């Protein structure tokens, strides 16, 4: 009811009346928790970008982190640090390129490491969360490189040094599953498992081809590292699920996010981060709307919620705003975060009821990526 700015004015007035002293200083952010959410603003390819650290419970910006060109943010699931791989140039968008990884303390937001990446090796692309990824123990950051060929960069966060590039096949995205292993999705319709050492040709294994050549898997699959669940929608809201928790890929049964009559009536997923997965609830959330088949990056106004095991629909929420990305807190009674690139607003919904609870606006220019830590 009372806004945060209102509660602050009240307290400031009380301190003045009471003669209360206080030292102006640099605040710490509150301890990272399950309802912290980070919104990255790729800013529609601006050379500099911003990340907003948000208390989702209060709907309050608690901090910000600056970044360079299309950085890839990662958040350690255990809340110990956050980091990004970023790119700057010596004269704004021109001149000598430096790619680097910074690691930040999640309370002071001070960079505790700044690790140069040799030979400007980052893949510059509209931000895909799974193109730069932390290994589960948090000691390694992996980043994708496209040019000259698909490759993956290995960065030692603990020793604060770049390690090596690994050559991989014609494959994309990086879902780490262990300190030395990740999966990628390959042009031929398989996943590739890549197991790497400090030196030597990485061991690369392919799964069976798991989708036909004309079934399109979106750029923003949800991957729960702690569950090893890769939830990969196709353009039609068909959802591939791959279980990587054994260390090898087990293909789960496909589910449809939309019914036959919905599909016949033009319903399709669309947006940017189209799918979220709540690990504890084993639940998929998909951004859908009625749309032509090639409007697959436009906002959507509905979220369907479906049991990941059975594909049973549990809800269809009318979000009431143009939503491009969703994600969920990973605690019980999760929040469903619904980020509107066009409104630059994070809408914070009760994931159970779909009700909008609060919102955080003025999140940059073109905010697209929501990240939460799964701390539980």
């Amino acid at each position: 009811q009372e806004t945060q700015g209102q509660a602050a004015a009240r307290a400031a007035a009380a301190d003045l009346a009471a003669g209360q002293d206080d030292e102006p200083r640099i605040l710490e952010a509150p301890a990272p928790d399950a309802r912290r959410v980070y919104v990255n603003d790729p800013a529609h390819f601006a050379a500099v970008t911003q990340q907003f650290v948000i208390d989702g419970e209060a709907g309050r910006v608690i901090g910000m982190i600056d970044g360079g060109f299309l950085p890839n943010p990662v958040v350690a699931d255990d809340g110990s640090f956050i980091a990004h791989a970023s790119t700057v140039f010596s004269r704004i968008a021109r001149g000598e390129r430096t790619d680097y990884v910074e690691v930040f303390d999640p309370v002071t937001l001070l960079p505790t490491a700044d690790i140069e990446l040799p030979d400007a090796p980052r893949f510059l692309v509209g931000t895909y969360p799974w193109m730069t990824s932390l290994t589960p123990d948090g000691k390694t950051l992996l980043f994708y490189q496209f040019s000259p060929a698909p490759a993956v960069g290995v960065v030692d966060l603990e020793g604060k040094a770049f390690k090596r590039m690994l050559d991989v096949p014609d494959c994309y995205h990086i879902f780490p599953t262990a300190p030395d292993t990740f999966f990628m999705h390959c042009r031929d319709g398989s996943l590739a498992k890549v197991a790497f050492g400090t030196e030597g040709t990485p061991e690369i294994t392919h799964t069976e081809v798991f989708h036909p050549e004309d079934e399109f898997l979106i750029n923003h699959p949800a991957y729960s590292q702690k569950a090893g669940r890769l939830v990969w929608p196709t353009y039609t809201g068909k959802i591939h699920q791959i279980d990587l928790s054994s260390g090898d890929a087990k293909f789960l049964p496909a589910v449809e996010a939309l019914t036959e009559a919905e599909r016949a009536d033009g319903w399709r997923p669309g947006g940017w981060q189209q799918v979220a997965y709540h690990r504890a609830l084993d639940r998929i959330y998909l951004l859908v709307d009625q749309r032509d088949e090639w409007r697959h990056k436009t906002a959507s106004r509905f979220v369907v919620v479906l049991d990941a095991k059975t594909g049973e629909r549990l809800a269809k929420f009318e979000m009431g705003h143009e939503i491009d990305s969703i994600n969920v807190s990973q605690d019980e009674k999760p929040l469903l975060y619904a980020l509107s690139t066009g409104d630059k607003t994070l809408y914070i919904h009760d994931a159970e009821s779909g009700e909008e609870l609060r919102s955080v606006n003025q999140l940059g220019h073109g905010p697209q990526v929501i990240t939460t830590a799964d701390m539980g």
Binding site: S147, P148, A149, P169, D170
Partner: protein
């Protein structure tokens, strides 16, 4: 008329009476069974061809005559880029200016002079009748007229539909008569989005009416010397093939080592490749491009020899801006490009593709 002139060229084209020892016609080195290239083995394999004396080798690979009639005459366009002409170095302005050269080249057909050519043409009563009907009485008695008339007949013959039928699978696909295999279609997609497009397509933008997969420009793509061909041709260990700079009247050192972008039509059947026949296999010619892009040690190794490609014959004026694309072709994209380029084979040479596959 256009018909009779081409029909006269058809006779000249296959007539070995136009070589000193009467062993060699145009058709000898430009064999119509081989997309107008030379199937004959010489001291450097198929890299370079052997002349009528049976000993002399050229220093350049014999190119197809297919589609050569679509090349513009040689000129410098407004951006200062040379375009068109005939021969790998553009030193002939057009087909007509090119046609009498092999006749008088002691390395090729080796007739001593125009008068020896005219005397051969007189010996044949069909030529007297054929030349006279098109060029007038006594044409064969004037060595200059006879020689020019033979070149004109020969250039007319090369302009006929038979040399440029446009009946490749690619042509059929572009008419909607058929579809590319999935591999071909990928090959086409790569060809037109990667750097090949910057040189092996007629136009910078828009659609060509009779595409022949060359912009007719001159580029030094940094090829090494073909040692065995260079030994066979006898030009010397210290010889440099300067490409376009060898054309009389080109003086600009920036043109050294640039050669005419070849039409990729029938490329699948006209191996070996490049101006000196240096690469035997189509795949090798495509892989050469990865030397500018790939960070992998193997990108620098010619797979035909297991050794480095070699220092460029001309280390200057390389087309680095186009060549250093920042993107390496993986083997699936190389396969796709082979399959696409095979679609550029004329209908009548489709049977020859079986052996190359």
């Amino acid at each position: 008329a256009d018909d009779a002139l081409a029909a006269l060229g058809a006779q000249l084209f296959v007539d070995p009476a136009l070589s000193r020892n009467a062993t060699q016609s145009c058709a000898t080195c430009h064999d119509p069974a081989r997309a107008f290239t030379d199937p004959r083995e010489g001291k450097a394999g198929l890299a370079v061809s052997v002349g009528d004396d049976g000993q002399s080798h050229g220093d350049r690979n014999t190119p197809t005559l297919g589609y050569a009639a679509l090349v513009p005459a040689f000129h410098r366009d407004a951006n200062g880029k040379y375009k068109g002409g005939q021969f790998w170095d553009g030193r002939a302005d057009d087909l007509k200016q090119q046609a009498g050269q092999p006749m008088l080249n002691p390395v090729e057909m080796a007739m001593p002079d125009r008068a020896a050519v005219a005397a051969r043409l007189r010996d044949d009563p069909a030529y007297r009748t054929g030349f006279e009907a098109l060029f007038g009485k006594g044409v064969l008695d004037d060595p200059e007229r006879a020689f020019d008339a033979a070149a004109e007949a020969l250039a007319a013959y090369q302009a006929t539909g038979e040399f440029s039928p446009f009946d490749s699978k690619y042509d059929r696909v572009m008419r909607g008569e058929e579809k590319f295999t999935p591999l071909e279609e990928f090959g086409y997609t790569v060809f037109i989005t990667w750097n090949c497009r910057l040189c092996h397509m007629q136009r910078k933008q828009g659609v060509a009416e009779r595409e022949t997969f060359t912009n007719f420009e001159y580029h030094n793509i940094g090829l090494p010397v073909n040692e065995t061909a260079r030994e066979a041709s006898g030009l010397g260990a210290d010889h440099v093939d300067h490409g376009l700079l060898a054309r009389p009247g080109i003086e600009d050192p920036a043109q050294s080592g640039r050669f005419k972008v070849p039409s990729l039509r029938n490329v699948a059947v006209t191996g070996p490749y490049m101006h000196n026949g240096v690469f035997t296999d189509l795949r090798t010619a495509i892989l050469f491009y990865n030397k500018y892009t790939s960070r992998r040690p193997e990108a620098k190794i010619n797979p035909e020899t297991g050794a480095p490609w070699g220092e460029p014959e001309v280390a200057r004026n390389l087309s680095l801006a186009e060549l250093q694309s920042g993107l390496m072709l993986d083997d699936g994209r190389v396969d796709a490009l082979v399959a696409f380029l095979e679609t550029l084979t004329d209908r009548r040479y489709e049977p020859l593709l079986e052996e190359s596959r």
